[PDB]
Amino acid sequence: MREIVHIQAGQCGNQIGAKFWEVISDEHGIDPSGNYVGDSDLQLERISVYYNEASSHKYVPRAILVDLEPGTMDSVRSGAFGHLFRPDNFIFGQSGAGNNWAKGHYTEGAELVDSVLDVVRKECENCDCLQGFQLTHSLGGGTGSGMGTLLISKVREEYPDRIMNTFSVVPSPKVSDTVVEPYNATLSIHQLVENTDETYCIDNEALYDICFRTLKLATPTYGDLNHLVSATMSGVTTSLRFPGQLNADLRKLAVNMVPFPRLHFFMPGFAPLTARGSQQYRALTVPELTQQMFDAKNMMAACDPRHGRYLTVATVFRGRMSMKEVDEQMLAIQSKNSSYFVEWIPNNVKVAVCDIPPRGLKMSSTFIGNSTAIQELFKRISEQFTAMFRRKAFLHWYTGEGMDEMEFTEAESNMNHLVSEYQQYQ
Amino acid sequence: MRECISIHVGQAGVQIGNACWELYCLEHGIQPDGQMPGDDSFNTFFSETGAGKHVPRAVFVDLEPTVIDEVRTGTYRQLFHPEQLITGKEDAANNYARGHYTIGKEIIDLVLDRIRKLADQCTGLQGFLVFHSFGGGTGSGFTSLLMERLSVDYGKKSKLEFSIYPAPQVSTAVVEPYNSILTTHTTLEHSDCAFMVDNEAIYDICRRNLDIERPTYTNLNRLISQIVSSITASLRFDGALNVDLTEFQTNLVPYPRIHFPLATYAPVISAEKAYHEQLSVAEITNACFEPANQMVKCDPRHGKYMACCLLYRGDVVPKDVNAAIATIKTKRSIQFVDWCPTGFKVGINYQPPTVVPGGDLAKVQRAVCMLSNTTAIAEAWARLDHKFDLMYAKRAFVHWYVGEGMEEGEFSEAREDMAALEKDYEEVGV
Numbered sequence: 001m002r003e004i005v006h007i008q009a010g011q012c013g014n015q016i017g018a019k020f021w022e023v024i025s026d027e028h029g030i031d032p033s034g035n036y037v038g039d040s041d042l043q044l045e046r047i048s049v050y051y052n053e054a055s056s057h058k059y060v061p062r063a064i065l066v067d068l069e070p071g072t073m074d075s076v077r078s079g080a081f082g083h084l085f086r087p088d089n090f091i092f093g094q095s096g097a098g099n100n101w102a103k104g105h106y107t108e109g110a111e112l113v114d115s116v117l118d119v120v121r122k123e124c125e126n127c128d129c130l131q132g133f134q135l136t137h138s139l140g141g142g143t144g145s146g147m148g149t150l151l152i153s154k155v156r157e158e159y160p161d162r163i164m165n166t167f168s169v170v171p172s173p174k175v176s177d178t179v180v181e182p183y184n185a186t187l188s189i190h191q192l193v194e195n196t197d198e199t200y201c202i203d204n205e206a207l208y209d210i211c212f213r214t215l216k217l218a219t220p221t222y223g224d225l226n227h228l229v230s231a232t233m234s235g236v237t238t239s240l241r242f243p244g245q246l247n248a249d250l251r252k253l254a255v256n257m258v259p260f261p262r263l264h265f266f267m268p269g270f271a272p273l274t275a276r277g278s279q280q281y282r283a284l285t286v287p288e289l290t291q292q293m294f295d296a297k298n299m300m301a302a303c304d305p306r307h308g309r310y311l312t313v314a315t316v317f318r319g320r321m322s323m324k325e326v327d328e329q330m331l332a333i334q335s336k337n338s339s340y341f342v343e344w345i346p347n348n349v350k351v352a353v354c355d356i357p358p359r360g361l362k363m364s365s366t367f368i369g370n371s372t373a374i375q376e377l378f379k380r381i382s383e384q385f386t387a388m389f390r391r392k393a394f395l396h397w398y399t400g401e402g403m404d405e406m407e408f409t410e411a412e413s414n415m416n417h418l419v420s421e422y423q424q425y426q
Numbered sequence: 427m428r429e430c431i432s433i434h435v436g437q438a439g440v441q442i443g444n445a446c447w448e449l450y451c452l453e454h455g456i457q458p459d460g461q462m463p464g465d466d467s468f469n470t471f472f473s474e475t476g477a478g479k480h481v482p483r484a485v486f487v488d489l490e491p492t493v494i495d496e497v498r499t500g501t502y503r504q505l506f507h508p509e510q511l512i513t514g515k516e517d518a519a520n521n522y523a524r525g526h527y528t529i530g531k532e533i534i535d536l537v538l539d540r541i542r543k544l545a546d547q548c549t550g551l552q553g554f555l556v557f558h559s560f561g562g563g564t565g566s567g568f569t570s571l572l573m574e575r576l577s578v579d580y581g582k583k584s585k586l587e588f589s590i591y592p593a594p595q596v597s598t599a600v601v602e603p604y605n606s607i608l609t610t611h612t613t614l615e616h617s618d619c620a621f622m623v624d625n626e627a628i629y630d631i632c633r634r635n636l637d638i639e640r641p642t643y644t645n646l647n648r649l650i651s652q653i654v655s656s657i658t659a660s661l662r663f664d665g666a667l668n669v670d671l672t673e674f675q676t677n678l679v680p681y682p683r684i685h686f687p688l689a690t691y692a693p694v695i696s697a698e699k700a701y702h703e704q705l706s707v708a709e710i711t712n713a714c715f716e717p718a719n720q721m722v723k724c725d726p727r728h729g730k731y732m733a734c735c736l737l738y739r740g741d742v743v744p745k746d747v748n749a750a751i752a753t754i755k756t757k758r759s760i761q762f763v764d765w766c767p768t769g770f771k772v773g774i775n776y777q778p779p780t781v782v783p784g785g786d787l788a789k790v791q792r793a794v795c796m797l798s799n800t801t802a803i804a805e806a807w808a809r810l811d812h813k814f815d816l817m818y819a820k821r822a823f824v825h826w827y828v829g830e831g832m833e834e835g836e837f838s839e840a841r842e843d844m845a846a847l848e849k850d851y852e853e854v855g856v
């Protein structure tokens with residue numbers, strides 16, 4: 001039936017992908033050995049979407065692991081769920097990308113990608129009906145950005161009408177885990193603004209603030225961040241993977257959420273979020289989840305939606321809910337928050353309600369916003385890039401890899417056009 | 427003899443269809459396996475096989491398997507013929523283009539042929555029933571296309587449809603106006619009559635009048651099912667006055683370009699209030715003519731009544747009925763268009779509106795269902811056109827439709843037709 005291919009970019013892509021498949025394996029009750037222990041038919045009903053049926057009935061998740069630094073993939077195989085993935089779908093060469101977008105994209109990753117595409121074609125040929133592709137990666141990483149970019153390019157060229165989206169880590173506004181990031185971000189964003197259907201911006205600082213504040217934590221790690229992200233992913237794919245009212249296909253979401261082809265960028269969000277023991281003072285109702293979802297503090301992207309206007313909003317729900325509470329809350333919210341929404345698009349909300357809640361919760365929901373604070377992200381990125389590029393810092397590496405300066409110029413031009421287009425509608 | 431083929435397109439149509447058919451099963455004493463352990467007016471809506479197995483006459487169509495798979499795994503899987511359940515591999519994505527053109531074209535032929543054989547089995551065919559959401563891509567496009575095809579093929583066969591009218595305040599999608607206007611364009615050019623219902627009004631009604639907690643689509647569909655069942659019940663049982671759908675066409679359509687009868691149903695009350703509430707025909711009619719009890723959010727007092735069709739069930743004597751109608755005639759808060767001497771027609775049915783086990787509606791020995799036209803619906807069309815005018819002025823989301831095979835001229839033409847409809851209501855309102 002309807003199927004989605006998940007391509008995990010190197011490093012953070014593979015890690016987040018690991019947690020992603022862990023969550024999905026928990027969702028459908030799939031043992032890490034590939035065995036189905038699930039207690040319901042809805043588990044295996046349409047499960048063919050993310051999984052394939054083996055001869056022994058063991059379920060192989062449909063995914064492709066791509067990294068130039070196998071150490072991560074080695075750690076993945078060393079993981080408990082590493083046995084789910086057949087050794088065939090592991091595709092890696094051995095070199096560092098050195099966080100060089102050009103080196104990864106043009107040279108060493110290009111000697112790889114063909115095999116990845118072969119595997120993609122295999123999976124695609126094994127698809128009854130292909131909805132599209134999804135790419136978990138990171139902006140600022142050489143492999144993630146370069147290889148992810150090359151991959152979405154080739155994949156789109158191979159599958160133009162198919163859905164293509166990516167969950168991409170975006171550079172942090174204050175600190176940075178690497179230098180040269182603005183270059184990779186700019187180039188990747190250029191190729192991403194032209195190539196994909198949609199992309200989800202997520203900054204670690206936002207998740208740090210959220211997890212530290214909302215969930216009241218002490219010493220967790222990236223796993224929890226990836227867990228959250230994968231929870232969001234599971235949410236949208238849950239709307240896809242289970243019955244309910246106003247069931248939302250991915251392209252339907254893409255249709256409702258994107259008025260203008262070139263502005264597809266979104267802000268993911270999730271509810272409910274409560275710390276241990278503080279949950280007892282909270283009640284589970286649609287108003288609560290909506291209050292959490294529309295809270296600027298719960299935005300997983302670094303931004304302040306208070307500055308901007310919503311072009312489109314999609315709130316997906318999970319569990320048993322009354323359509324009324326949703327309707328009333330959306331109406332009241334849109335009513336009192338007026339001027340936070342674009343005036344020439346009446347009814348900016350897209351509602352989808354799944355009857356199947358996530359494990360452990362009576363109800364859950366996720367928030368996909370569209371706003372110009374993304375333009376603000378593009379502003380800071382453009383600024384940093386301009387600062388670094390003006391003095392031609394680190395440029396000799398990319399130039400050494402055969403990357404022409406005109407491409408940087410073009411990328412910046414397109415980014416400026418993009419943010420300008422964000423400012424155009426406001 | 428007199429038979430009708432039901433049609434359910436989209437989640438709305440299918441679920442409403444489910445409610446409708448379970449209600450039918452309850453009314454005819456049939457059980458999910460297609461058995462019933464005088465009523466041949468059920469043979470009207472049900473065919474039969476050598477084993478005495480009674481199966482419904484309907485066609486379920488969803489471009490995505492989704493709900494229909496729930497139906498296939500549902501209790502009534504033993505009821506419906508496996509061929510009557512038709513599923514594609516993906517939806518219209520709230521895009522009129524797909525459903526009307528890109529997807530449905532590879533499906534609709536099958537659907538049409540199945541409807542044709544289903545029509546071949548009929549001793550006689552009065553018409554069709556099309557259930558869909560208004561503004562939903564699948565329902566909109568596919569029912570537009572299907573209505574065109576059916577209109578071409580079956581000619582003068584009555585075409586009736588129950589559409590869910592988009593609510594003014596609340597919406598499940600941003601693109602609903604486009605699909606809605608394209609729908610009413612291509613549908614108006616074909617459909618004989620269309621019953622408009624707005625979920626918000628149903629919410630207000632059930633909440634306020636039924637005095638219940640915040641409900642879901644279920645009992646909503648049950649109410650719609652009650653209305654539809656009341657109509658078909660006017661057809662499905664021998665009362666004092668029996669009514670053919672052609673008569674609904676005759677009475678509710680003074681002009682070919684205007685058919686949009688608004689549904690209203692009374693009494694609607696809690697089981698507790700039913701004890702204190704005295705049910706009389708006059709009071710029920712008074713409740714029927716109440717603007718708050720209408721199934722659409724349009725206010726009838728902003729326009730005049732053109733045609734009004736009242737369908738009675740259970741215990742009703744035409745004496746106090748005509749008396750009540752006169753009592754209504756005396757009231758000038760309710761005004762009728764000047765050139766219409768009388769817009770009233772009264773159906774009478776002996777069988778009462780049976781209640782569904784686990785249902786929220788109180789049991790009553792009588793009930794009334796109004797089908798009537800007003801220009802307040804033109805006001806609704808106006809607000810719809812306004813929303814569309816905005817979103818179209820900014821050319822939002824158009825690239826989908828365009829890339830998927832729609833032309834801007836179609837949108838323009840549709841809008842022009844809407845303007846024409848507005849002026850039609852305006853001129854007729856004189």
Ligand SMILES: Nc1nc2c(ncn2[C@@H]2O[C@H](COP(=O)(O)OP(=O)(O)OP(=O)(O)O)[C@@H](O)[C@H]2O)c(=O)[nH]1
Nearest residue numbers: 436437438441517518519520559562563564598643
């Ligand atoms: N009254 C009522 N309306 C419904 C119901 N289900 C869906 N709707 C209406 O349908 C609209 C949503 O579009 P759908 O009809 O679900 O579209 P679809 O059938 O899924 O087909 P696609 O648009 O291609 O996905 C909402 O605005 C509702 O008004 C229902 O069970 N009862």
Ligand SMILES: Nc1nc2c(ncn2[C@@H]2O[C@H](COP(=O)(O)OP(=O)(O)O)[C@@H](O)[C@H]2O)c(=O)[nH]1
Nearest residue numbers: 011012015099138141142143144177204222225
């Ligand atoms: N959410 C999340 N982000 C990560 C994780 N690991 C790395 N990152 C992000 O990725 C960036 C580092 O880039 P990296 O992927 O290591 O460069 P690459 O080796 O060229 O792909 C940092 O800014 C981090 O924010 C992770 O486990 N979770």
Ligand SMILES: [Mg+2]
Nearest residue numbers: 436437517564
């Ligand atoms: Mg649908």
